[PDB]
Design a binder for this molecule. Structure first.
Ligand SMILES: CC(C)(COP(=O)(O)OP(=O)(O)OC[C@H]1O[C@@H](n2cnc3c(N)ncnc32)[C@H](O)[C@@H]1OP(=O)(O)O)[C@@H](O)C(=O)NCCC(=O)NCCSCC(=O)N[C@@H](CCC(=O)O)C(=O)O
Ligand SMILES: CC(C)(COP(=O)(O)OP(=O)(O)OC[C@H]1O[C@@H](n2cnc3c(N)ncnc32)[C@H](O)[C@@H]1OP(=O)(O)O)[C@@H](O)C(=O)NCCC(=O)NCCSCC(=O)N[C@@H](CCC(=O)O)C(=O)O
Ligand SMILES: CC(C)(COP(=O)(O)OP(=O)(O)OC[C@H]1O[C@@H](n2cnc3c(N)ncnc32)[C@H](O)[C@@H]1OP(=O)(O)O)[C@@H](O)C(=O)NCCC(=O)NCCSCC(=O)N[C@@H](CCC(=O)O)C(=O)O
Ligand SMILES: CC(C)(COP(=O)(O)OP(=O)(O)OC[C@H]1O[C@@H](n2cnc3c(N)ncnc32)[C@H](O)[C@@H]1OP(=O)(O)O)[C@@H](O)C(=O)NCCC(=O)NCCSCC(=O)N[C@@H](CCC(=O)O)C(=O)O
Lengths: 424, 424, 424, 424
């Protein structure tokens, strides 16, 4: 397409990404060669697009090569690496080489880059009988110092190294560190830059999007490498991060493509908090009634007698929290086998605005999809826009199922009519 | 002495040092061993005393050992080192090791420490036929980014490395870099931390204090090592820095002793700008007259006829700038061979407050010292405090030379009498 | 010792004191003579060390002398003074004299000093039948205006005077005022500057440190003078202040010695909040189990069957809040009569970080000290550092009691071994 | 009038006064009695109207009464008072009493009030043979600390007391101090609050407005009391202050009446900088030409041949600076003896905007007033608004002098016509 078509395509993603915080976990293989130069170009750019960036890099792969080649053999317990005083020594050397290459890569294509003593570490200790030695975990993250720099527009660079109150230095696992830091910053996005195109489903495909549950179900049959990833991503998500993404840092431009296109190569994981939605039974009726009466009192909902409710209960779904009822919604069917109706959609004013609306709308869309329903209607006097903004086209009365066009004319309400098409 | 006697001793030096900027050039030998731990302790402390700190470290000595040992031979032109792509490589490694050791040393005895891409470098190029290669000089110092961090209370750490617009990295001479950076920050103090107790005079003594002239006169007969130091110190001073100091980083506590004691081990260099002070001759008389008439008009100065001036001209010193007369002062002598008087001390209101007063007072103190004068008097109606604050004790009339006690009683002025003792 | 030994000694105390707020209650006797000049020197210094200072002074002793001498007799009810319109009058005069002397004392050895209308007062009213008249208490403290000035680095000076909405002025008791103000600022330190070396124990010794309980037990048999002190200190502590201290303002340098030495002359009082720690009995077992199972599930704790627990319950201490169990810890004994072991140390993740750990560690240290135990061991896989940072030296297996060295080899865990020596 | 008529009257004065700085020199007699309460009410109000307030008070009158009554006799040299250690002592007492009364007066009718060590003083020394002793002058004003508090909205209170580097305290003359401080703050207004209705002209009237010249001409025949006032006011004005005012603090509401009414009781002094305006002669013609040609080139001015200029030179006034010509303007006369015209009004673009326009307009208004001219016309194509905003009503051609109505129709320009009536 044209340049102008591409920029207008990314525009909405720039608007979202702007002022948000993005923490990037970089495999250290990427920080060597023609790949490092392009990584800095796109990162440079992100800075320019006003995204607050935190960058941590890995070292395991360097170390592990320095080892084998120089005689010794690296050893890993429960995923984590044993790092001896000498591994630690060269981990510090590597960090100074990578920070410096990157810095140069960034001036070769202004942008301001900062590092500090932001991380304090304790030793992992002993795992399954094995002393890990200089393997550490982040004990304290200087979250104020971080935000202070990000506020200033500076790119934050972090080696896989934190220090202890005792004057020792520890080697940190990039993947767990990226996740920790991100959760401290309550960052909106954690991005792991790997050498893989993402996380594959069992059928060898690339899982474009995943839930933290779907992801967790993939880990059982998965390489231990991507097992630890998933666990850190799932940990991040639970800890606050809005979205974590896995990309191939070796795929030229992938970072730009992931962030500013609709489709975006690579895989993204998010956690949709659990809300309990279930078929209504005889007992919710007093609750549902309690919820909808005020509404039908205001003339927003059509009146629904307890009796009606008693013999129409199966059309109803209720959304609950701790046995409390906070929402409901009904799917109506018709002679026309394609049509459905979302009816009696209500969330209590106190639990409003938390996304419950959406969740009941979705829920009955799956119900309606299960029974071969393609067109789904919604009539309302004072809430049509909500539907407009969620996949609905205003409709005409002559386009309703016959029975509903007839209630429509008797009503005397003139509610607005909106339809949405449900797909295969 | 007691703890309380020591703290009260340092108190005035803390008051001066506070909020001022101090740039420290560290020999990299200091960043290894039990010496690094104590360096960080005292630096940690300085941070706590509210001194803005910038820290750059050297690498030549590491490199040069890595070289010889590993076969190769280092080479230096006009003081500067030839650093090849491989020297550069390990200079980056060293920097990552030293920054990290220091960081740990600082947590083992909270304090916030920051580094950035503050320096942009160009290659030195070719010197006397020799390609220097990866030897660079600071082309641009990010002075805003620096001040921004110092304002935040952060300690700034800088490796001897800056980058180019071309994506290359260059090795910087710590000593020249420290001086450049300091001059950009217009820092009040540059401190070089060496392995020597300072700069020795020809007589093998340690030159406690020096002027940028005295220092420059020492460089001719001096080791090339301390030659480059002096030139960087003298360059700093000319460029703005108020004071540069040379200490032995290996002398435990020297840094604290230099900054917060009266005497302070090690050597300090400062530049006193040039002001021309000379004996008056026949021609200054209209100028001097012009200067002092307003004053004697106000009754601050005793009246001095042109005639008086004509046959007393040799008592007079004048302070001038571009042939312009901005001050004057007279030394009076007496039957009493010990006594002098500072008389007719005046600086034009326009050039007042720049220290001219001081300079004429000093000047005639050297005159008065040259002719065996120990007690120096000063009488005035409205300016006695100035003298109080500069080494003067209020005196009684019965303590003046006889002739002056007699003018004193006739006068009818009752001017205040202050004396100051001049020494061997 | 050397200057350098003294500065490095105070360094940790400067680091703590920095940015913290210190409110000083000054007996007004100190504000007269050679003692006032040194008080300002050390206060000047504190300002320079970045401590936020609030200074309130007393007046009772002046007033009371002005009285008797000028005929009249002062009278005090429940500790507080009756101040009549004329006492009030001269209390305002004194305040203007003391503020001004201090100000001068501070310029004679830059530092910025501010006073305002920060205090609004109501009358105390009538006490035990007696009209107190112009005796007031602080009704409102302008806490925002205060912080605003302290933020600016200014020293805050406050007379023992506050005003009313009615346009009257009241005399405030310095001691209660200092405590009130401090509690408003939630200051980390309240310091009373008296004419006494502190608070004496019954045996005529100077109580170096006290708890707000120990202190309160001293007040019964104590001079009414120090009774009111204690009550204000205890009130401050309960109200938020971290530490209150009593010094002799007439003891030259005491203020510097109190704040920046380990030992520090004078007496300090602090409140350790109450946490209930008691021997475990049969009933805690399900709770303790609940607490430690997750841990032994993670392999952090060795497994402890309910049965074990049932016949080892007396080794156990539990830490509780409102009948809730939040921690536990066991002392193990051995054939070796000198040895103990802290075992099964656990605090629930929810009440973690509040210092509960410390409190159980301490607690069993007192238990272990009670039964002649000098060496106390602690083995763990993932928490050795905690012990390092609390008085523990890493140990070797060959140094455990025999039985424990044997479990150690069977275990197959290789936990880290740390010891700490308990004293007489 | 009505409340609404009064508020709308003051509105323009509130708009001017807002955000401006006002320094008030208060006679200390005002700070006692029912007069102090009302002074604080109106000052309180000023604070509320967003005027930055600095308040210094006097003490001479208190002292001088304390003296005589208690035996001793006060003595003054060149206006300034001899203040001995004991005068100084009670000057500090008075200051503490007045600050405190005022503070209370201000709470009896929220508003934030601050004092500090803002003033550093040196002794005046000896005057005409007399030791002044504790008479001081402000040597340094902490101008940053002041602005910092004013920025915060705080009312600044200053006693007539400043300190020395030597730890001494000096008595300051309120009147000279107010003027100094004001000039440091470059305050827009200095206000002296006296016990007099202002400064009287020789004819015993109250001089409503004065120039710093008119004022200075009144001082020769004036009481020494008001002599020193005038000199301080004139000194303030020269030093930057836009306006200084003298009021009677004992006249209830005078302060409000002075600041927020058109007329305002009491007397105000301002300095109109000197600009040289004189009749043109033969020599300015090339200059005037140079000035107006560009303009008549643009068609803003009617063309005026050198010849015209040569025989019309007496109609011309020129405004000059250092022999440079920066403006000109011509007064035209007519058969109609009442009419004038401002013609050929021009200021060079470089010296534009400095008020030169105004000054030439005024100047020829005085010329035109001198020769019996009441109506003054001004025609222009592109600058009519300037005249509208300076006392001019748009006019019709039929209202011009006949000759000018005739040039008007030939012109073919249709310039705008504005008139202004000049009075007796
Ligand atoms: C609209 C409801 C369901 C959204 O709940 P909830 O807040 O949990 O969902 P949500 O968090 O996903 O959406 C929140 C956002 O929607 C927006 N929103 C809320 N009410 C809106 C409205 N009336 N118009 C536009 N936007 C609205 C909010 O501004 C909020 O904005 P944001 O995205 O944060 O910028 C909730 O406000 C509610 O229960 N309102 C009262 C009930 C109601 O209006 N029901 C009508 C549904 S249409 C179908 C229906 O029930 N019809 C009737 C009869 C009508 C007839 O036939 O004439 C019947 O069946 O009996
Ligand atoms: C005092 C003079 C010399 C200082 O010049 P200059 O400003 O260049 O020196 P400086 O920069 O080193 O000092 C500046 C500082 O001194 C301070 N200062 C200036 N005048 C001061 C004063 N009168 N009192 C206290 N401090 C003063 C300034 O505040 C400034 O303060 P800072 O340190 O920045 O905080 C200058 O202000 C001046 O020329 N004043 C007028 C002349 C004058 O007062 N001469 C008296 C000298 S005593 C000897 C003398 O000439 N006596 C008479 C007769 C007297 C008799 O016998 O009765 C005679 O021989 O004829
Ligand atoms: C470590 C515990 C006790 C501290 O509780 P609590 O937080 O209330 O105490 P606290 O507030 O005084 O200390 C908090 C500070 O300690 C630090 N901290 C917490 N865990 C740490 C760790 N693993 N390493 C270093 N520092 C740690 C925190 O960072 C915090 O830092 P801060 O001072 O605020 O900068 C708590 O985290 C906990 O219960 N962790 C899980 C239990 C555990 O690790 N127990 C091991 C104790 S060693 C003895 C033991 O029970 N051994 C086993 C078997 C072992 C074997 O023989 O192989 C047995 O007897 O069965
Ligand atoms: C308008 C002149 C005189 C003001 O000089 P100056 O800047 O020194 O005075 P000022 O500082 O007191 O006033 C400055 C303020 O006036 C405002 N101002 C300047 N030009 C303005 C304009 N054309 N309209 C409205 N306001 C204007 C400025 O905005 C400034 O605003 P501020 O108060 O700071 O917010 C100056 O801009 C100038 O020389 N302009 C070019 C000459 C010009 O326009 N002369 C016309 C005067 S009317 C009389 C005249 O000379 N007529 C012709 C023929 C016309 C005919 O008969 O058709 C003749 O006799 O040959």
């Amino acid at each position: 397409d044209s340049f102008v078509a591409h920029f207008r395509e990314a525009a909405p993603y720039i608007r979202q990404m702007r002022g948000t915080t993005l923490v990037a976990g970089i495999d250290g293989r990427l920080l060597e060669g023609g790949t490092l130069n392009k990584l800095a170009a796109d990162i440079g750019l992100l800075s320019q697009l006003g995204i607050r960036l935190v960058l941590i890099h890995g070292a395991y792969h360097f170390l592990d090569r320095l080892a084998a080649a120089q005689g010794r053999t690296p050893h890993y317990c429960r995923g984590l690496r044993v790092t001896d005083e000498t591994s630690l020594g060269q981990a510090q050397q590597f960090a100074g080489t990578v920070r410096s290459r990157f810095e140069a890569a960034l001036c070769g294509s202004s942008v301001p880059l900062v590092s500090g003593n932001f991380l304090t570490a304790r030793p992992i200790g002993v795992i399954d009988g094995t002393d890990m030695e200089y393997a550490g975990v982040i004990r304290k993250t200087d979250t104020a110092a971080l935000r202070f720099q990000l506020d200033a527009g500076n790119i934050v660079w972090m080696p896989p190294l934190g220090h202890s109150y005792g004057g020792k230095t520890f080697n940190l696992d990039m993947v767990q560190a990226a996740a920790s830091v991100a959760v401290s910053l309550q960052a909106e996005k954690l991005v792991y830059l790997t050498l893989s195109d993402g996380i594959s489903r069992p059928d060898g495909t690339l899982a474009e999007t995943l839930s933290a549950q779907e992801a967790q179900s993939l880990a059982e049959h998965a390489a231990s490498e991507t097992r630890r990833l998933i666990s850190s991503a799932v940990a991040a998500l639970e800890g606050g991060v809005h979205r974590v993404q896995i990309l191939n840092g070796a795929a030229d431009g992938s970072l730009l493509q992931e962030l500013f296109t609709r489709n975006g190569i690579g895989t993204s994981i998010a956690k949709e908090a659990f809300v309990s939605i279930r078929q209504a039974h005889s007992g919710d009726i007093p609750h549902i009634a309690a919820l909808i009466r005020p509404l039908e009192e205001q003339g927003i909902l059509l009146h629904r007698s307890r009796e009606y409710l008693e013999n129409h209960i199966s059309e109803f779904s209720i959304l609950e929290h701790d046995g409390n009822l906070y929402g409901c919604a009904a799917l109506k069917t018709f002679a026309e086998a394609d049509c459905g109706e979302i009816a009696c959609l209500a969330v209590s004013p106190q639990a409003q605005d938390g996304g419950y609306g959406e969740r009941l709308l979705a829920h009955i869309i799956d119900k309606a999809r299960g029974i071969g329903i393609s067109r789904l209607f919604a009539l309302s006097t004072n809430t049509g826009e909500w539907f407009a903004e969620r996949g609905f086209q205003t409709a005409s009365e002559d386009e309703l199922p016959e029975t509903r066009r007839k209630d429509y004319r008797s009503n005397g309400r003139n509610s607005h009519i909106l339809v949405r098409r449900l797909h295969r």
